[PDB]
Amino acid sequence: STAAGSLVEDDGFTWDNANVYFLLTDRFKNGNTANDHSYGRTLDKDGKPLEGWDTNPGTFHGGDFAGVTQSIEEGYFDNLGVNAIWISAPYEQTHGYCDSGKGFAHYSYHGYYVLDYTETDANFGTKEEFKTLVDTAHEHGIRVIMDIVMNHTGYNTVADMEQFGFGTLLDGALDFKYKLTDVGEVNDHIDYKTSEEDWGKWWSNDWIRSGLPGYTEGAGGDLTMSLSGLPDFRTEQTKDVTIPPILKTKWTQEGTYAQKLAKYGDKNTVTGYLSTWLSEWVREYGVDGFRCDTAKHVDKASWNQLKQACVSALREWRSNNKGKAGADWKEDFWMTGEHWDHGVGYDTYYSEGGFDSMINFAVTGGGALASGSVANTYQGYADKINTKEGFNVLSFMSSHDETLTRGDENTMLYNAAAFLLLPGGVQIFYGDETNRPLYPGVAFDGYGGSGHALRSDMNWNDMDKTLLAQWQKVGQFRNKHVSIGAGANVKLSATSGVAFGRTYDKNGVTDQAAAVIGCNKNSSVTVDVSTLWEDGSYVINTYDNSSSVVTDGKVTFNSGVNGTILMENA
Numbered sequence: 282s283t284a285a286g287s288l289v290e291d292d293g294f295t296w297d298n299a300n301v302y303f304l305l306t307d308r309f310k311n312g313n314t315a316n317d318h319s320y321g322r323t324l325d326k327d328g329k330p331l332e333g334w335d336t337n338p339g340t341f342h343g344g345d346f347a348g349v350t351q352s353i354e355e356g357y358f359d360n361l362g363v364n365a366i367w368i369s370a371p372y373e374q375t376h377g378y379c380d381s382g383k384g385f386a387h388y389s390y391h392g393y394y395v396l397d398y399t400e401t402d403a404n405f406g407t408k409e410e411f412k413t414l415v416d417t418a419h420e421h422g423i424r425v426i427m428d429i430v431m432n433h434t435g436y437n438t439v440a441d442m443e444q445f446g447f448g449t450l451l452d453g454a455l456d457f458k459y460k461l462t463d464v465g466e467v468n469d470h471i472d473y474k475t476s477e478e479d480w481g482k483w484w485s486n487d488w489i490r491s492g493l494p495g496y497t498e499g500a501g502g503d504l505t506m507s508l509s510g511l512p513d514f515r516t517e518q519t520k521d522v523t524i525p526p527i528l529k530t531k532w533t534q535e536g537t538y539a540q541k542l543a544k545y546g547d548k549n550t551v552t553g554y555l556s557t558w559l560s561e562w563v564r565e566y567g568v569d570g571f572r573c574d575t576a577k578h579v580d581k582a583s584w585n586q587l588k589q590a591c592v593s594a595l596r597e598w599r600s601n602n603k604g605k606a607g608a609d610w611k612e613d614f615w616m617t618g619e620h621w622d623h624g625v626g627y628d629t630y631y632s633e634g635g636f637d638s639m640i641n642f643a644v645t646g647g648g649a650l651a652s653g654s655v656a657n658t659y660q661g662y663a664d665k666i667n668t669k670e671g672f673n674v675l676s677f678m679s680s681h682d683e684t685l686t687r688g689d690e691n692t693m694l695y696n697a698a699a700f701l702l703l704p705g706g707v708q709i710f711y712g713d714e715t716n717r718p719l720y721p722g723v724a725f726d727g728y729g730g731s732g733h734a735l736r737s738d739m740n741w742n743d744m745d746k747t748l749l750a751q752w753q754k755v756g757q758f759r760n761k762h763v764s765i766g767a768g769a770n771v772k773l774s775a776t777s778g779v780a781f782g783r784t785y786d787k788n789g790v791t792d793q794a795a796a797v798i799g800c801n802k803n804s805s806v807t808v809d810v811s812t813l814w815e816d817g818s819y820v821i822n823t824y825d826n827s828s829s830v831v832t833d834g835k836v837t838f839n840s841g842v843n844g845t846i847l848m849e850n851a
Contacts, residue, residue, distance in 0.1 A: 285570065285615030285637040286673050288788045289763060292422045294364055295790070296570070296615045296637055297666075297673055298766030299706030300759050301426060302363035304349070305681065306371075306405055307341045307390035308711065308739050312348020313410075317341065319403035320376035320440055322388060325459045337461035338720045338733050339378065339387040346371070346406040346414040353417050360753050361714060362760030365424040367572050368392070371411050372429075372562065373400035377438030377458060380465045383723040383733060391681060391736065392428065393574060394435025394511075397531060398558035399541065408566075415566045419606035424569035424615075427562060431555055431587060432575045433511030434484060434491075437471060445530050447482035448493075449475055482530060487522040488551055490515050504580045516552045516583035523547055524554075552583045556590030563594035563614060567607050572675075573636070576618025581633035588616045588635045617675055617706075621729065625665040625705075627672050638706060641674035645683050647692075650699035652779050652799050656772055659781050662704040663770030667785070676700075677708035684727045685710075685719055685735040690747070691843075697751040698798045698845040701759050704783070705766050710735070714752035716745035751843055758823045758847040764792035774834075775808035777801045778844065782813035795820065795848040800840035809834040810848065819851035 286296040317323050322341055323334040335342045349368065352358065358366065369392025376396065381387035392402070401411045418425045439454040441447070454470035473480075477495040486495040490505065491512030499505025499513055507513045524532075524547065532538030545557050562568045571591070576584065591614040602608040617638035618630050624643050630636040641662075643649055649658040666674055678700045679685045686696060693716060701707050711717065719725065720737030727735055759765045767790065768783030778799030785792040793813050800806045810820065811834025818831050822838045824847045829838045838846050 283611055283613045284671055285612045287670055288611060289790045290610055290612055293763060294422065294424065295763055295767060296612065296706065298759070298763040299365050299638070299675060300363050300701070300709060300756060301365045301367045301675060301706055302358055302361065302709045302711065303367040303681065304369075304711040305344070305391050305736055306346070306349055306369045307344040308736060309344040310348025310351050310739075310741070311343030311345055312351040313345050313406065314343065316345040316347070316404050316406060317343035320444070321458065322376065322404060322440070331459065331461055333461045335738075337385050338722055338737065339381045339385040339390060340461050341388045341390050341404055342738050343404070344739075345404060346410040350410070350414050350417050353421055353423065358423060359421060360757075361709065362753070362757035363423065363709060364760050365426050365570070366418060367426040367428050367708070370395065370428045370430065371401055371405055373397040374402045375435035375438050375441055376444065377440030378464065378467070379436045379438060380467045381731065381733060382465055383726065383731070384465055385462050385723070386460060386464045386467075387731070389435060389438075393430055395430055396435055396441060397528060398555065399561065412566055415568060416606055419567065426570045426572050427568045428574070429559055429571045430574045431514060431516060431559065431584070432578045433508060433513050434489060436511065437483065439467065439471065442471065445482065445527055447479060447527050447530070448472065449479050482526040484512070484525040484527055485522065487518075487520060488515065488525050489513070503577055506578060508575050508578050514551055514555060514579065516555065517580045518551055520550070521548045522551060522554070552586045553590075556587050559587065560590040560594030563591045564598050567595065567598040567602060567605070569607065569610070570615030570617070573616055573618045576630060576634065576636065576639075577620045581629060581635075584616070584618070584634045584636065588614060591616070623674070625662050625674055627665075627669055631671045637671065638673040638675050640708070641676045641705060642683070644676045644678050644700065644703060647678055647686055647696045647699065650678070650696055655699050655798065656779050656781070659702070659704060659770045660772060663768065663783065666705050667767055667769055673705055675706035675708055676703045677710065679710040679713050679735065680708065680732070681710065681736055682727065682729050682732040686713070687716070687718070693748050694751050694843045694845065695799050697748065698755055698796070698843075701752070701755045702765060702796050702798065704768070704770060707759070707766070709752070709756065712739050714749050714756070715740055716748050751845065754824050755845070755847060758849065762792060762794040762849060763790055764794045768793060771812040773809050773812065775800065776806055780808040782810055784813065793850060797840070797846040797848065800844045800846060802840055802842060802844045804840050805837045806840050806846055807835045807837055808846070808848075810836055814850065820848040821851050823847040823849055
């Protein structure tokens with residue numbers, strides 16, 4: 282089998298050691314200022330950008346594939362040792378905005394609110410720039426995790442419902458398109474009820490379960506609930522359907538309609554289409570994996586097909602593009618589910634769902650990383666995850682929905698080490714490396730809320746170079762050492778703080794690595810690594826490239842300014 286996380290790829294990547302830079306594309310660099318224009322988003326009635334457009338915390342600041350590309354070209358990620366980029370979904374989002382309720386326009390900047398799995402969002406860019414991006418990413422060896430949604434559609438928005446004539450826009454809806462702030466009224470202009478035919482032009486009842494007229498809601502919680510009021514794809518359903526009415530409309534405003542049908546055909550299951558269209562991105566550009574949003578909320582059987590489709594598609598793409606960047610990769614199409622508050626433990630997502638990975642919430646807020654506990658946290662995870670194939674997690678301590686962890690320089694320094702050293706994958710949410718603050722503005726909204734507090738603009742002006750160094754040094758260390766995610770934890774004895782080792786021995790991966798966290802500064806740590814390393818082994822403390830041979834099991838590194846020691850085998 283080639284199930285994602287069952288070999289090490291030629292370049293040393295494995296989904297067991299995923300270091301996933303989750304970036305909201307809008308919030309990274311606006312690398313092409315023309316994109317801000319796309320679909321008339323940020324502009325007024327004259328086509329001039331609205332005054333606050335780049336500051337309003339839910340408008341598109343304009344971050345784009347090109348500026349992500351520039352970030353890659355700059356090697357920002359490469360300095361962090363990131364090996365997967367989880368972009369906000371690249372397919373064409375909902376053009377307009379929904380009411381954030383915190384008063385500002387929530388423009389879909391985050392890339393969940395799908396409009397068309399076949400097209401790119403012109404604010405992120407063309408397919409060519411996307412092709413360029415994924416080629417750039419694959420050129421850098423960064424896996425593009427596409428952050429797809431198969432659960433739910435985007436919300437309907439004025440700009441779409443204008444452009445595609447679906448649903449009902451009431452009078453003055455359009456003017457809201459020209460507003461950044463005090464836009465909670467916006468939905469009062471969108472009529473979710475009066476006609477099944479206007480909404481009939483949106484997806485279809487055979488495609489959506491929702492409160493929309495027709496569109497019958499799903500039976501109950503989890504696999505059939507409209508999470509956050511997002512309309513939910515009837516991926517449960519084996520019924521054959523057409524292309525959705527909105528996409529009859531869209532593709533006929535364009536010309537490609539007839540080409541597409543000749544590619545998809547008129548009849549499939551919703552899963553089979555969504556398989557088809559989503560796996561087309563895999564079929565066309567070779568996207569490496571999906572973070573499945575809300576995996577808890579649609580049928581694991583339907584999630585099962587999708588992987589096999591995207592498995593099938595990536596095989597095709599890898600057949601077409603032979604010698605393209607990433608045509609030769611071998612791990613099957615990796616799929617991770619955001620089961621909310623998932624711990625560590627083998628469950629049917631890895632079997633019914635065919636998921637390779639689940640997002641592990643137990644690390645949120647660093648509570649598991651407190652020096653009074655983190656010793657055992659690394660044991661509890663490595664035993665569970667790194668012993669069961671097809672079993673993995675993606676640990677995170679900040680996210681677009683949960684928390685954004687801030688405190689004393691030492692706590693950021695400390696949690697930076699204590700966090701990224703976790704077994705399994707880790708999610709570097711953007712700007713944690715930089716001390717990116719919460720946005721000055723409407724009060725905090727994490728813990729599974731809209732997380733706008735967490736999604737402030739990337740503070741490129743003010744990068745906390747010292748904290749950056751920490752996340753760079755630790756992140757590069759993690760990236761090089763697959764055992765950090767994939768290896769069995771051995772607890773180690775140290776003079777101060779906490780220490781551990783890890784071994785990994787599968788698929789020839791044959792890797793082992795250690796660390797010490799929070800050791801008292803500028804001082805000889807004397808940590809017993811005898812369980813990893815025989816006493817002639819050299820650690821290199823990759824925090825500063827200092828070297829200290831083991832002695833009677835101990836190594837005697839200077840703990841340096843931040844008391845963090847990143848102890849690879851030389």
